Amino acid sequence: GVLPRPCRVLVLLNPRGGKGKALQLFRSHVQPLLAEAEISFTLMLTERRNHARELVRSEELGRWDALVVMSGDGLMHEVVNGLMERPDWETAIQKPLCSLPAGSGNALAASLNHYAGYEQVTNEDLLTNCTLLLCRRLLSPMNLLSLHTASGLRLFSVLSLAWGFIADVDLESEKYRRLGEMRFTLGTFLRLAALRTYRGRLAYLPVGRGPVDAHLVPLEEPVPSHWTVVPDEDFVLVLALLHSHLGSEMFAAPMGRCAAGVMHLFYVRAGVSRAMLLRLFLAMEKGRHMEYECPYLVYVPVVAFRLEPKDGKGVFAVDGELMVSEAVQGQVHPNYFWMVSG
Amino acid sequence: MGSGVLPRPCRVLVLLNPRGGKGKALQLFRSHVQPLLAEAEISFTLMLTERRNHARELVRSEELGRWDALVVMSGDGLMHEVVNGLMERPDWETAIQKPLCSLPAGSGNALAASLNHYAGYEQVTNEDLLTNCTLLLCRRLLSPMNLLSLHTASGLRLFSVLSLAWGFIADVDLESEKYRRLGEMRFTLGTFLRLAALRTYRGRLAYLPVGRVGSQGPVDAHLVPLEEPVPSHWTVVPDEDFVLVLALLHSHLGSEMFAAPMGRCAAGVMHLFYVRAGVSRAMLLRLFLAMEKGRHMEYECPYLVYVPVVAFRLEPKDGKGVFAVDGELMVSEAVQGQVHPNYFWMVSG
Amino acid sequence: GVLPRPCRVLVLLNPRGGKGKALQLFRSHVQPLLAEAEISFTLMLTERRNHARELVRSEELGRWDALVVMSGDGLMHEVVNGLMERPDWETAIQKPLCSLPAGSGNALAASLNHYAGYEQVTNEDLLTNCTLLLCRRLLSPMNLLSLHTASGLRLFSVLSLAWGFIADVDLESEKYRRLGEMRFTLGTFLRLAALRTYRGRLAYLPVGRVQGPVDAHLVPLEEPVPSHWTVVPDEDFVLVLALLHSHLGSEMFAAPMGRCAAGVMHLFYVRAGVSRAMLLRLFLAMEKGRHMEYECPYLVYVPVVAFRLEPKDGKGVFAVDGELMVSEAVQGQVHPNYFWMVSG
Amino acid sequence: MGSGVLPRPCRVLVLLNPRGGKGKALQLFRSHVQPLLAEAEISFTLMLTERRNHARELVRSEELGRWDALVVMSGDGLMHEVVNGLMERPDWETAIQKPLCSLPAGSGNALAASLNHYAGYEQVTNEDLLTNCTLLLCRRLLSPMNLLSLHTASGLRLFSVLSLAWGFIADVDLESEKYRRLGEMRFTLGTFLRLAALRTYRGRLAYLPVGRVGSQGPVDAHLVPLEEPVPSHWTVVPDEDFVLVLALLHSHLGSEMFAAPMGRCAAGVMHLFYVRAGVSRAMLLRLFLAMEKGRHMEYECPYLVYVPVVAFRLEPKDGKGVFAVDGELMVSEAVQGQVHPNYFWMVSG
Amino acid sequence: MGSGVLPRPCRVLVLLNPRGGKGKALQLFRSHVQPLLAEAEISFTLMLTERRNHARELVRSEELGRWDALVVMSGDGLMHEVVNGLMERPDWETAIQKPLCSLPAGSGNALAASLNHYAGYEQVTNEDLLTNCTLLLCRRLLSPMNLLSLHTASGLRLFSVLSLAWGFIADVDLESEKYRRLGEMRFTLGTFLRLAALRTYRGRLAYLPVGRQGPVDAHLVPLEEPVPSHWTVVPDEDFVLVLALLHSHLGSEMFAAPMGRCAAGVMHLFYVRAGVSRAMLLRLFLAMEKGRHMEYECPYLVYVPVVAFRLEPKDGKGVFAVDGELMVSEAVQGQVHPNYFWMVSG
Ligand SMILES: Nc1ncnc2c1ncn2[C@@H]1O[C@H](COP(=O)(O)OP(=O)(O)O)[C@@H](O)[C@H]1O
Ligand SMILES: Oc1ccc(Nc2nc(-c3ccc(Cl)cc3)cs2)cc1
Ligand SMILES: Oc1ccc(Nc2nc(-c3ccc(Cl)cc3)cs2)cc1
Numbered sequence A: 001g002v003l004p005r006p007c008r009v010l011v012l013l014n015p016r017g018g019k020g021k022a023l024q025l026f027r028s029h030v031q032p033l034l035a036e037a038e039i040s041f042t043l044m045l046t047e048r049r050n051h052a053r054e055l056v057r058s059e060e061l062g063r064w065d066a067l068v069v070m071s072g073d074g075l076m077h078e079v080v081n082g083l084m085e086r087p088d089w090e091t092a093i094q095k096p097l098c099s100l101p102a103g104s105g106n107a108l109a110a111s112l113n114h115y116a117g118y119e120q121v122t123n124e125d126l127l128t129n130c131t132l133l134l135c136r137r138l139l140s141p142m143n144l145l146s147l148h149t150a151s152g153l154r155l156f157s158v159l160s161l162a163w164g165f166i167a168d169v170d171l172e173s174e175k176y177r178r179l180g181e182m183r184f185t186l187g188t189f190l191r192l193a194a195l196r197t198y199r200g201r202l203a204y205l206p207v208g209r210g211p212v213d214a215h216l217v218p219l220e221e222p223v224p225s226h227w228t229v230v231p232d233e234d235f236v237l238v239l240a241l242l243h244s245h246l247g248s249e250m251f252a253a254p255m256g257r258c259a260a261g262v263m264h265l266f267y268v269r270a271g272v273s274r275a276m277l278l279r280l281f282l283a284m285e286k287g288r289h290m291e292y293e294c295p296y297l298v299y300v301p302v303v304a305f306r307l308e309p310k311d312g313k314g315v316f317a318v319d320g321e322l323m324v325s326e327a328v329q330g331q332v333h334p335n336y337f338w339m340v341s342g
Numbered sequence B, D: 001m002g003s004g005v006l007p008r009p010c011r012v013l014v015l016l017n018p019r020g021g022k023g024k025a026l027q028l029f030r031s032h033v034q035p036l037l038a039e040a041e042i043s044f045t046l047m048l049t050e051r052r053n054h055a056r057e058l059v060r061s062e063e064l065g066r067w068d069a070l071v072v073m074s075g076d077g078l079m080h081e082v083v084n085g086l087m088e089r090p091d092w093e094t095a096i097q098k099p100l101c102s103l104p105a106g107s108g109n110a111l112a113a114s115l116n117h118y119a120g121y122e123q124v125t126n127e128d129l130l131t132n133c134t135l136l137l138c139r140r141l142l143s144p145m146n147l148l149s150l151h152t153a154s155g156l157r158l159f160s161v162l163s164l165a166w167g168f169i170a171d172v173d174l175e176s177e178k179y180r181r182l183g184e185m186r187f188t189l190g191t192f193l194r195l196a197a198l199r200t201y202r203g204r205l206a207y208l209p210v211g212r213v214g215s216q217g218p219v220d221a222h223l224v225p226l227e228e229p230v231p232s233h234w235t236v237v238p239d240e241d242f243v244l245v246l247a248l249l250h251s252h253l254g255s256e257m258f259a260a261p262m263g264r265c266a267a268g269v270m271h272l273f274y275v276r277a278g279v280s281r282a283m284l285l286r287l288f289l290a291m292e293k294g295r296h297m298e299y300e301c302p303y304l305v306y307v308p309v310v311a312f313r314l315e316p317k318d319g320k321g322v323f324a325v326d327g328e329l330m331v332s333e334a335v336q337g338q339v340h341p342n343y344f345w346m347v348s349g
Numbered sequence C: 001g002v003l004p005r006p007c008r009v010l011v012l013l014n015p016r017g018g019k020g021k022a023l024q025l026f027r028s029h030v031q032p033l034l035a036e037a038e039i040s041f042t043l044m045l046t047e048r049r050n051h052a053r054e055l056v057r058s059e060e061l062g063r064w065d066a067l068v069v070m071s072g073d074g075l076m077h078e079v080v081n082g083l084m085e086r087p088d089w090e091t092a093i094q095k096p097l098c099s100l101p102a103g104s105g106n107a108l109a110a111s112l113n114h115y116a117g118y119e120q121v122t123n124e125d126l127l128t129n130c131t132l133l134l135c136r137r138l139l140s141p142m143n144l145l146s147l148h149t150a151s152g153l154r155l156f157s158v159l160s161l162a163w164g165f166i167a168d169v170d171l172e173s174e175k176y177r178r179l180g181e182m183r184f185t186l187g188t189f190l191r192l193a194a195l196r197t198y199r200g201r202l203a204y205l206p207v208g209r210v211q212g213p214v215d216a217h218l219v220p221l222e223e224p225v226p227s228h229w230t231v232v233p234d235e236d237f238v239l240v241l242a243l244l245h246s247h248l249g250s251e252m253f254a255a256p257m258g259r260c261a262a263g264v265m266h267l268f269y270v271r272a273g274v275s276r277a278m279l280l281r282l283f284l285a286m287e288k289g290r291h292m293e294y295e296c297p298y299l300v301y302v303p304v305v306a307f308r309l310e311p312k313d314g315k316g317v318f319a320v321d322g323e324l325m326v327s328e329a330v331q332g333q334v335h336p337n338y339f340w341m342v343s344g
Numbered sequence E: 001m002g003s004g005v006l007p008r009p010c011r012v013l014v015l016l017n018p019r020g021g022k023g024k025a026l027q028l029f030r031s032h033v034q035p036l037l038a039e040a041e042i043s044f045t046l047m048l049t050e051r052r053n054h055a056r057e058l059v060r061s062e063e064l065g066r067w068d069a070l071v072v073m074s075g076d077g078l079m080h081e082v083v084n085g086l087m088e089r090p091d092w093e094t095a096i097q098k099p100l101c102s103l104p105a106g107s108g109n110a111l112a113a114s115l116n117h118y119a120g121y122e123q124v125t126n127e128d129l130l131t132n133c134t135l136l137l138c139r140r141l142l143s144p145m146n147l148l149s150l151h152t153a154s155g156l157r158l159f160s161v162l163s164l165a166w167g168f169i170a171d172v173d174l175e176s177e178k179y180r181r182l183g184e185m186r187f188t189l190g191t192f193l194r195l196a197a198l199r200t201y202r203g204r205l206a207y208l209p210v211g212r213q214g215p216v217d218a219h220l221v222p223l224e225e226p227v228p229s230h231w232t233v234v235p236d237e238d239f240v241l242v243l244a245l246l247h248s249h250l251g252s253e254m255f256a257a258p259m260g261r262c263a264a265g266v267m268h269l270f271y272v273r274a275g276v277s278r279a280m281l282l283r284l285f286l287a288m289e290k291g292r293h294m295e296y297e298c299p300y301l302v303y304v305p306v307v308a309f310r311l312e313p314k315d316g317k318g319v320f321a322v323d324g325e326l327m328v329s330e331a332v333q334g335q336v337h338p339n340y341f342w343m344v345s346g
């Protein structure tokens, strides 16, 4: 569970999204540490969409000891799905992966920084720490969510599946990739000041009760009897999350790192006041949002779920990336890829 | 940091063992706990236990809906009975989610000690510890905790909230029950006297470390039947001569035994410690004493081994070995266990 | 590197090879030890040549922690070729093996007993020791010899390939199977009295000059040998012997330099011109591993990774791990650490 | 036990360093060796070899066909030169088969001490050792021996017949040269003095264990370039702080240092020892002292590791390390090696 | 499913218990079976079977494709292990169709004895018996056989090829082991002892007579519901013995069911009710040798053909003999499945 020393690493870096500085930051904050650690690297700049995915899908992986993704959660989403689309996905997905933050959504990197014992740092301190994790070369396994859509598309998630309030802010937030991390804050405040609700059917398989998704039945079927069908059909948000953090300053799952093959499921049922949600959002920065007595926020650890938006298409965010659908279910696979971490 | 709250106000069932704080749990409840509850607008009802499995049988038949939490005032022993009672129920999946609370009266209060530690408190003992744990109850914050599922050679399946010990620790526990009046110092006594009457224990230990896991009640998917060898991806310990084996889910082995000073266990993880035969008494004593301040690791005894595990199997090797399970004696030929992540909720802060 | 405890093992036992006592020996000398070590076994009895091979070719290998072969070297020859003939040969040949001596030729079990530190014991003493080795469950890799014949047969050797004197004694010997180890002794004295030489050409590739696995050192038999190979000038021989282990039988410590390195085998040959009396000296000295301490210009030793051998007069008779094979030419390459045996 | 024999009668080239044995090598030849050769019908010719690489250049250019054996009278150092001289030859593959013989003079006679041991003699020293090695040559028996192939960061490739040492052992071989007049006891004095400032050495050690191998001169197939990491099936040692690392091909480190009592190396195998930082001075000394009787393994000191290997890599952190190769000083950034099975032949019994 | 013959030539796996025919099974095989096989071109491989359940694990993990049939050379208890092993495989549906064959070695060869009877042979024993069944295998003809599906209160689901016995029969099978070394004869000595100690057992017996995952037992209702209303609930609550028997013989010399071979899906149910005299019970036992026991019309001995039954021992628990293998429970029930597997027969 350690990278060779010396080793070599492919760094797939997005020179633009977030700030336009990803490459200069690499140079000032990442590179000097790589050199002392004897990690030589090659930079490949990712031009546009699916570029990274297609690169990884066609890559001779045997030349690399790890792949490092320097951008946001989206890039890592691209990389892991590209490895999963290959004929040789079974061995390909075992290539070690690393996440260095530059984008606006650095949840995976913020999570790993958390697991390593660091304070909840941000930006350049976050980059440096994640870089230090890479330089110590230690790897641990990570869970993978297998998704399935209304139209028979399989995709994989490494961080989260979101619906309702969260997906909306993520969508409308893009018109300020400019504000950085803060774009989600402005984007929440204003959706929150003008709060609304969404209609669907949530079901899941709690912990108590491509790879085969043994727990899932065709989306056409009713769920199995042993699943839990949520009574409500009116939510402010549904969220499946595989890690501790939603962003570098959103400690959304204060019980910490998930167990193998388990995901965090949250939902806010309809009825909350805007002042409560704000209070909750705000509390989430320090991960204090569960310390509040609010029958509207429900938490469950699960291995599977299904969400059907009532009346046409709901907007979903998968690892922060927008997605239109009418029905998705998914199952968590344990310990399915290696990441660098402490 | 907290992952849930009790309602305010709330109602609480209190299971108390009157032969505890040796003999005066009730008076401690009355002096140290009740007035704090009253100000926190926590209603309670006191139920008195005493007899074996009583608390277990009660929790098994309880209508859990009337209570916001179960507060167990006694030792680790009583928490063990309650959790096993909830797990034995037909509706165990929902019953294990009733929040639980540990208020130290009994002899061994490692659970309460750990939670006081997690909360940022000094390492306190007796009534300072009781007051701290009650303060936690008053603040109402909940965290999920891991649970160890155990299986014995005789086919018993049982749960453990704190610890499985074998060898020196298990003997000293069983012995020591005479000096129980002497309160928590009963273990320092036992440990001192047995460290001079050292005996070793032969058996086989295997385990599954965290890093090496691939892709009635819950199923323990990591475990194979005891008559089968362990899976090849496990570590099978070479040494078959032991002073002790300890599986521990928490930071503390007693109100003054900071046994696991590396960090708090992740979800689905516990600490495994064993001490292989041939250590010198004086090194074993320095380990003990340094344990009080959690400095025993700083010594690298390469006779003492620690590993974060998700499951283990332990076979003594010369008849029905003597184990302590969350402090309670149990004898059997072989035992194995797997941790289940965040299975029940406790008051903590 | 170690079998599971408890474990389960298939014993392929040939019930009448050697003196024909294998099964009672297993019952007397082996079974009590396996019970104490917590090794369940199932016995399968072999009925004829190739039986063992066929059982192993079609066997469900996932039910077994090892295969124990209780016979001579020939049964192990059959078991290993059985695994190599399977489509899943690459994982199959990684099943651990163990050899318990109970035929007349027990070179492999004698070599393993030697590597484990014991004395050069015979019969039930040998059987006991090799059982003590299984009970302790330790495993180490062995080399494998890959062979190609003129007819285009591909076969594997775990122990030896022999031509000339040795191959002839093995075949003629067969009627003294009942005499255990003395089979080769009587067999040797007899052949000595009618000492013949044999015509052929020998080439090899020494250690310095360096569907199944690929034999990268080998080229088609029809083509001449690589220029970097050694082509022995001599062309009349008394014997040629490729040997992967230290013992040629339980009392023939043929390779006193001991256990081969990975990927290496012992090649010996005796050139034409030796007298009967000297060949007899070498042979008796070989009991104690002393035969190389004699000044004998006819006995040549080289460690090699490959060899080719062509009997120029028609079909030469070979013994492969003691099994008779007839052929116009053979070549082979040894592969390192190709399978697991129980040893110490 | 012998794997070949010298002819009787035979003739031998004797390469002798007149400076060794405190300058008495030639007179020791005359008193202890010559009279035995005569009775054994061994002819000889003596060639004096004292300047640097002299003996190496001799063996490189010699017509080896005129000799049955080369006998080397001096230390491990001269054996080292001769063997490297043979391997530097364009006909090295036949040259390296010339039987070699090691006759002890002076100190640093670990090779002669091992052969004397393999043959069954007591651990004798000085003239007794010389006599014994001489009686081995008269008996004419030959055995093949392992050879270590080394590569340094600077790109040099060399061969080692005995050992590669780094850290404390190398520092003492080096600091020790001044008391060369005292003989073998200089390593005691050197060890004793250097123990006072026991320093540790920072580096990275990786090796290939015997059981883990799967499927210019000779090719070193187990080795990859010094700038690539070692193959993933090697063991990288976690500790990066050592007092010593020793690769050793034979039983003796010196004529009174039975360092490898666990048994003679099989073909293609060597011993690897290292001492992790944090042993006390006293225990290091006790391990040293116990080495006289090959008893140092009996302490099971947790700081001393032994492993049979076929290849290793050792990379001093902090620029150049000081190494000893067959006792001779060599300085380098990084060194790796692998053992070649039974490459040359030596007289032994 | 399919036709009732073996291929010629064929190859066969032989599971032999060596500790049988008092330690002679293998020698019996060598002198009595092997030369017959060789002439019929039946290839075989022998595999020996030590411990309890060993045959069962072996058959459960076996690559069935290598074999045209599995021969069991032991007693009824080995056949029992073999079938249960086949029925425990994920692929139980195809596995249960591999033909089986039963060669007698030593005691407890009811099944073998039945087959030899159905074949038209005289009631022979030991080596004569072994030779006949071997001739059967050489002739290569097969018949379908009934299989009994058993469920226990503890949720245990097992299968019987021959019998479920309780009371007097089960005790004699148990108490018999302490001198198995005596052979078939030991059943006679156990019988003689239990008889002087004649006792009854408390129980409730119910059946469905002929007139009115795993395989589905649709005649059976869960052991907690009462039996369906059309079943016959026997009034007696005290028995000397109860015996579900799928074949004509209880042993080589015990022709226990002479009223005719069972049709597909039928089994024999016998019971002896409380009150029979010792001398009478013993008369039944002795006359059963030549199948003459029913000719007594002794009112204590009851016979019915059935398709399903329920037995509830109510003196706490009961020990059963299931194909002669011992087992203990508070409640069992079963349903015969018709023509469920293949066996060499004539
Ligand atoms: N039951 C059997 N009857 C006759 N020959 C057999 C039997 N089982 C195996 N054989 C064959 O007999 C040959 C001799 O076996 P081997 O193990 O080499 O013993 P030995 O050491 O006496 O040569 C092997 O080729 C083997 O396949
Ligand atoms: O990517 C986004 C992240 C957070 C938000 N904002 C909000 N999150 C929440 C919220 C509260 C609790 C949990 Cl567990 C998760 C999210 C309420 S408002 C919007 C988009
Ligand atoms: O309940 C008990 C606790 C400790 C003891 N005695 C001892 N424990 C230890 C010990 C040392 C190290 C660890 Cl990690 C844990 C316990 C040494 S002596 C006996 C009973």
Ligand SMILES: Oc1ccc(Nc2nc(-c3ccc(Cl)cc3)cs2)cc1
Binding pocket: C165, C166, C167, C169, C170, C184, C187, C188, C241, C248, C249, C252, C254, C268, C279, C282, C283, C286, C291
């Ligand atoms: O299986 C056999 C083994 C040896 C022999 N006989 C002989 N072997 C030899 C011999 C001599 C030297 C060596 Cl290195 C090996 C064998 C001489 S006579 C016959 C059959």
Ligand SMILES: Oc1ccc(Nc2nc(-c3ccc(Cl)cc3)cs2)cc1
Binding pocket: D168, D169, D170, D172, D173, D187, D191, D246, D253, D254, D257, D259, D273, D284, D285, D287, D288, D291, D296, D304
């Ligand atoms: O040439 C030298 C040999 C030994 C020493 N000194 C020492 N060696 C050791 C030592 C201990 C154990 C082993 Cl296996 C080998 C050497 C301890 S101190 C110095 C120079």
Ligand SMILES: Oc1ccc(Nc2nc(-c3ccc(Cl)cc3)cs2)cc1
Binding pocket: D192, D193, D194, D195, D196, D281, D282, D285
């Ligand atoms: O008071 C003194 C103490 C040590 C010394 N000198 C030396 N000590 C050592 C030495 C060697 C081994 C040990 Cl364990 C301790 C000291 C070598 S030189 C001199 C004066």
Ligand SMILES: Oc1ccc(Nc2nc(-c3ccc(Cl)cc3)cs2)cc1
Binding pocket: E168, E169, E170, E172, E173, E187, E190, E191, E243, E250, E254, E256, E257, E270, E281, E282, E284, E285, E288, E293
């Ligand atoms: O395996 C055994 C077979 C028969 C017996 N003993 C007896 N069986 C009977 C008997 C009577 C009538 C029938 Cl239909 C069947 C058995 C009477 S005494 C004991 C053990």
Ligand SMILES: [Cl-]
Binding pocket: A008, A009, A040, A041, A042
């Ligand atoms: Cl690179």
Ligand SMILES: [Cl-]
Binding pocket: C008, C009, C040, C041, C042
């Ligand atoms: Cl088995």
Ligand SMILES: [Mg+2]
Binding pocket: A072, A073, A074, A075, A105, A319, A320, A321
């Ligand atoms: Mg994104």
Ligand SMILES: [Mg+2]
Binding pocket: C072, C073, C074, C075, C105, C321, C322, C323
């Ligand atoms: Mg043979």
